[PDB]
Amino acid sequence: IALSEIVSVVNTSDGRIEVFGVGTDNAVWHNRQTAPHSGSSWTGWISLNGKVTSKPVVYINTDGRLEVFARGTDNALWHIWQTATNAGWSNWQSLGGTITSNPAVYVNTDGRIDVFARGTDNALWHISQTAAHSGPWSSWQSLNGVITSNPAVHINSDGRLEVFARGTDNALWHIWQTAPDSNQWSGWDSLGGVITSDPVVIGTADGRLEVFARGSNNALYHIWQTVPHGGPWSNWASLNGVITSAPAVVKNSDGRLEVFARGTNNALYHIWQTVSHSGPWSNWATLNGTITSAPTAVEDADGRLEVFARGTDNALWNIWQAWSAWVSLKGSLIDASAIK
Amino acid sequence: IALSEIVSVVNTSDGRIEVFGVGTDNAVWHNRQTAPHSGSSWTGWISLNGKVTSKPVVYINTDGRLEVFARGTDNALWHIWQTATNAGWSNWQSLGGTITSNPAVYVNTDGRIDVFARGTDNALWHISQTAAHSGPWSSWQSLNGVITSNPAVHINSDGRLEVFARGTDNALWHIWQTAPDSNQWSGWDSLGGVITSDPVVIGTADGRLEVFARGSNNALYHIWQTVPHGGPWSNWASLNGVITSAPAVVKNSDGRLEVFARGTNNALYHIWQTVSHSGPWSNWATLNGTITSAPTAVEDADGRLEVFARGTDNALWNIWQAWSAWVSLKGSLIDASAIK
Ligand SMILES: C[C@@H]1O[C@H](O)[C@H](O)[C@H](O)[C@H]1O
Ligand SMILES: C[C@@H]1O[C@H](O)[C@H](O)[C@H](O)[C@H]1O
Ligand code: NA
Ligand code: NA
Ligand code: NA
Ligand code: NA
Ligand code: NA
Ligand code: NA
Ligand code: NA
Ligand code: NA
Ligand code: NA
Ligand code: NA
Ligand code: NA
Ligand code: NA
Numbered sequence: 001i002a003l004s005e006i007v008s009v010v011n012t013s014d015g016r017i018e019v020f021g022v023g024t025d026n027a028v029w030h031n032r033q034t035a036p037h038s039g040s041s042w043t044g045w046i047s048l049n050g051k052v053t054s055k056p057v058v059y060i061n062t063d064g065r066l067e068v069f070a071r072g073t074d075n076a077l078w079h080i081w082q083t084a085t086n087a088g089w090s091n092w093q094s095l096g097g098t099i100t101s102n103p104a105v106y107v108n109t110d111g112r113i114d115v116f117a118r119g120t121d122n123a124l125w126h127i128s129q130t131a132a133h134s135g136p137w138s139s140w141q142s143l144n145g146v147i148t149s150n151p152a153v154h155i156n157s158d159g160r161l162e163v164f165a166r167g168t169d170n171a172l173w174h175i176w177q178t179a180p181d182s183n184q185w186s187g188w189d190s191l192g193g194v195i196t197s198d199p200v201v202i203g204t205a206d207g208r209l210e211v212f213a214r215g216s217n218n219a220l221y222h223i224w225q226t227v228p229h230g231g232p233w234s235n236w237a238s239l240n241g242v243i244t245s246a247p248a249v250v251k252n253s254d255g256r257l258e259v260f261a262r263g264t265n266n267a268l269y270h271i272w273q274t275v276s277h278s279g280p281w282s283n284w285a286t287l288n289g290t291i292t293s294a295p296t297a298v299e300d301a302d303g304r305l306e307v308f309a310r311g312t313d314n315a316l317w318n319i320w321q322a323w324s325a326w327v328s329l330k331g332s333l334i335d336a337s338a339i340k
Numbered sequence: 341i342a343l344s345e346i347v348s349v350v351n352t353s354d355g356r357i358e359v360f361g362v363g364t365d366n367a368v369w370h371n372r373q374t375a376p377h378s379g380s381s382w383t384g385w386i387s388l389n390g391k392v393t394s395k396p397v398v399y400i401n402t403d404g405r406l407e408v409f410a411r412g413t414d415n416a417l418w419h420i421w422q423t424a425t426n427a428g429w430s431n432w433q434s435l436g437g438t439i440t441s442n443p444a445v446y447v448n449t450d451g452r453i454d455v456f457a458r459g460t461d462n463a464l465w466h467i468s469q470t471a472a473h474s475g476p477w478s479s480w481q482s483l484n485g486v487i488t489s490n491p492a493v494h495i496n497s498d499g500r501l502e503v504f505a506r507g508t509d510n511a512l513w514h515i516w517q518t519a520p521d522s523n524q525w526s527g528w529d530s531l532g533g534v535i536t537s538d539p540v541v542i543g544t545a546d547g548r549l550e551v552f553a554r555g556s557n558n559a560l561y562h563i564w565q566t567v568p569h570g571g572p573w574s575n576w577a578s579l580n581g582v583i584t585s586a587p588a589v590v591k592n593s594d595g596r597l598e599v600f601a602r603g604t605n606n607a608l609y610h611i612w613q614t615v616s617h618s619g620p621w622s623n624w625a626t627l628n629g630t631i632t633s634a635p636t637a638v639e640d641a642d643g644r645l646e647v648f649a650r651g652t653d654n655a656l657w658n659i660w661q662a663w664s665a666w667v668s669l670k671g672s673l674i675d676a677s678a679i680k
Binding site for chain 1: 472521616641
């Protein structure tokens with residue numbers, strides 16, 4: 001499994017980017033822009049405490065309250081949430097279970113968060129809010145299968161959640177809601193290939209799921225729905241390059257997809273759709289630096305891509321689509337990924 | 341009340357703009373881009389039938405299904421919906437009541453559509469889905485007050501719905517959910533001023549509501565929350581000009597607000613934030629043409645603003661942020677606004 005993303009990042013409901021990572025104390029720490037603009041100063045690192053043994057995953061509730069999901073030292077799923085939009089935090093609370101992957105988090109069309117994680121049986125399990133942005137949570141429920149990567153989840157343009165994960169054959173597999181807001185899940189389906197990273201999945205400007213992963217030759221590959229929220233899927237297509245981290249995907253303000261990954265020389269590289277969301281892909285270009293994690297990309301309140309990656313000093317570094325000079329957010333981050 | 345918008349417009353879940361207007365037969369007709377790109381050809385006008393006596397208002401359910409709300413010849417609220425995302429339509433169904441305004445439509449954080457309309461008592465009434473993107477609908481319920489414009493609704497950055505309407509003193513009044521997804525509504529509050537148009541309301545890139553309306557001198561005015569999802573509100577500020585239609589507001593792909601209105605010479609004019617979502621406003625610039633409605637603006641799948649307005653031939657005309665030459669979508673539209 002290619003070197004993981006080290007932070008979970010979100011553009012908050014007041015347009016300030018907030019980043020969540022794991023400190024050398026295995027606590028979750030966060031850092032937020034002081035202002036909703038490219039090149040803003042930062043609050044600096046503030047601890048949410050806890051003791052995590054996964055990548056922490058933040059998600060924005062449909063009422064704007066941030067909620068962080070992470071595996072605990074007891075291998076249960078834990079969460080912590082803002083008690084008001086962009087204000088103070090709850091205490092950590094256990095959602096129980098015994099999980100063996102990073103959590104994958106998405107919200108249903110009814111505002112109920114759904115959390116996916118590998119179980120001790122290596123099956124895909126999930127648990128969900130029983131009310132919009134609210135407990136109590138459901139029972140843990142199995143979607144079966146046997147998976148060998150962290151899962152990734154995205155909503156279809158018709159409101160059906162869809163989960164992607166590597167199988168025991170190293171192929172990309174996926175499973176989906178057959179109706180929004182439901183525990184009517186499909187059978188597992190193979191999209192084939194051989195992937196050597198977690199998959200990442202995004203929704204296109206024309207309402208199709210598209211999945212990115214590293215292949216056996218360490219090139220970036222992608223595959224997509226050929227119709228909105230539906231099969232058949234394309235063949236795998238190479239975006240070439242040689243990448244030494246998981247790829248991170250993000251949509252530009254104009255709908256153009258862009259992918260970030262570490263190269264052989266440990267520099268940050270990127271590749272993007274040109275002209276429009278239906279235009280031809282660029283060639284790889286370097287953004288220099290020396291990074292010791294996969295990059296994480298998010299669009300800021302100015303419509304500019306922002307990229308975060310750990311540096312050789314274990315600080316989190318930032319670069320944005322001006323591109324800007326590399327800037328340090330300081331801190332000391334560890335890779336707590338549950339699957340490496 | 342300044343000349344109304346003549347169409348309801350939405351960027352659908354597969355990135356194609358769809359427009360809804362009223363034909364000379366008082367039926368609702370729609371027209372959709374063939375492709376998710378600026379300057380796309382159009383399907384041409386297709387009837388949803390019905391007999392409406394308001395502006396029709398389309399809203400996208402959280403599962404991607406379009407739903408149109410309009411007053412019927414019996415003065416009840418009627419609706420019609422897609423049975424699948426971007427596919428076929430239901431039959432018209434009555435939601436009952438007796439309404440005296442255009443409907444104002446928004447979705448709660450739990451995916452339940454809320455529809456607001458003036459009653460025969462000139463109070464603000466509302467009715468809502470009792471389940472995410474689903475009937476059955478609630479009882480009609482009064483929020484009291486006495487209003488003299490069509491209502492406008494927007495969600496706060498903390499998930500609380502907020503409704504704006506002109507009062508008997510010609511001031512801008514507003515009322516809000518004190519909690520998301522609830523019938524706990526606040527008291528009416530006056531934002532003062534004297535408005536001679538329906539208000540339009542939008543959410544800023546930094547999570548604040550901002551309201552635009554024509555003033556007694558026919559200048560464009562605006563007022564805003566000074567903090568995310570909260571008071572106090574700013575003073576009214578003039579954006580000047582002399583406008584002969586309701587203003588239409590839209591957010592650029594980069595968060596910059598932009599307003600469209602008809603000028604004294606019946607040309608389309610616009611004014612925009614420069615530099616960023618926190619930058620200084622431009623001066624008014626003409627986009628020429630001769631329009632016989634207020635304009636309606638929406639962002640397309642290429643991140644470009646698209647504007648629609650009725651022409652002197654009663655066709656719907658289109659111009660986009662290339663700016664492009666004016667292009668006719670043909671058809672023959674009427675202003676069915678319930679308040680003129
Ligand atoms: C604006 C343009 O956008 C591309 O997607 C890429 O990030 C380029 O480096 C940038 O200059
Ligand atoms: C790109 C730029 O955006 C502005 O908001 C305005 O629409 C201008 O006319 C356009 O040229
Ligand atoms: Na990262
Ligand atoms: Na937020
Ligand atoms: Na920055
Ligand atoms: Na939620
Ligand atoms: Na759903
Ligand atoms: Na920002
Ligand atoms: Na219009
Ligand atoms: Na749609
Ligand atoms: Na167009
Ligand atoms: Na809905
Ligand atoms: Na709500
Ligand atoms: Na479009």
